[PDB]
Amino acid sequence: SMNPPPPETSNPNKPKRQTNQLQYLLRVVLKTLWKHQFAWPFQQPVDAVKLNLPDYYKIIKTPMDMGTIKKRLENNYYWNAQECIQDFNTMFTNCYIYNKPGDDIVLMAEALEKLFLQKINELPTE
Ligand SMILES: Cc1cc2ccnc(N[C@@H]3CCNC[C@H]3OCC3CCCCC3)c2[nH]c1=O
């Protein structure tokens, strides 16, 4: 049992809300990053068993990925946009911590982050 349980994508006790900013995050931000050519390694939790990365979850204690973010948006898990923005940042940060600088996966994350920040810059008013 080397993979941890994935991050939660629903919770009956966590208050839920539908807002235009959260809709924008799903329909524009996530959608754009999801279909990008570099998205696929970030589309699901890092599978340390299948990818043979035994030390991944020894190093990364706050895992996050776009598959989880997608589910959280679809399930109305978030109350606000900043929670979601934080999750994207966690995903990128993890990549920059675990992998050495100049690694292709880091360059991929950087391209996705650049695109992400552009779309967040264009976030609609509530
Ligand atoms: C999110 C994520 C996924 C991932 C998958 C596989 N391997 C990773 N780390 C490796 C560490 C050793 N150097 C090579 C790295 O993987 C190579 C990339 C090349 C581009 C396509 C994906 C695998 C991963 N690290 C992660 O942070």
From Swiss-Prot:
Ubiquitously expressed. It is found in: Nucleus; Chromosome. The record marks 99 as: Acetylated histone binding. Signal peptide: none annotated. There is a cross-link at residue 58 (Glycyl lysine isopeptide (Lys-Gly) (interchain with G-Cter in SUMO2)). The NET domain mediates interaction with a number of chromatin proteins involved in transcription regulation (NSD3, JMJD6, CHD4, GLTSCR1 and ATAD5). The C-terminal (CTD) region mediates interaction and recruitment of CDK9 and CCNT1 subunits of the P-TEFb complex. It is also required for maintenance of higher-order chromatin structure. It is linked to Cornelia de Lange syndrome 6: A form of Cornelia de Lange syndrome, a clinically heterogeneous developmental disorder associated with malformations affecting multiple systems. It is characterized by facial dysmorphisms, abnormal hands and feet, growth delay, cognitive retardation, hirsutism, gastroesophageal dysfunction and cardiac, ophthalmologic and genitourinary anomalies. CDLS6 inheritance is autosomal dominant. A chromosomal aberration involving BRD4 is found in a rare, aggressive, and lethal carcinoma arising in midline organs of young people. Translocation t(15;19)(q14;p13) with NUTM1 which produces a BRD4-NUTM1 fusion protein. Chromatin reader protein that recognizes and binds acetylated histones and plays a key role in transmission of epigenetic memory across cell divisions and transcription regulation. Remains associated with acetylated chromatin throughout the entire cell cycle and provides epigenetic memory for postmitotic G1 gene transcription by preserving acetylated chromatin status and maintaining high-order chromatin structure. During interphase, plays a key role in regulating the transcription of signal-inducible genes by associating with the P-TEFb complex and recruiting it to promoters. Interacts with p53/TP53; the interaction is direct. Interacts (via CTD region) with CDK9 and CCNT1, acting as an associated component of P-TEFb complex. Interacts with RELA (when acetylated at 'Lys-310'). Interacts (via NET domain) with NSD3, CHD4, BICRA and ATAD5. The interaction with BICRA bridges BRD4 to the GBAF complex. Interacts (via NET domain) with JMJD6 (via JmjC and N-terminal domains); the interaction is stronger in presence of ssRNA and recruits JMJD6 on distal enhancers. Interacts with NSD3. Interacts with NIPBL. This is Bromodomain-containing protein 4.
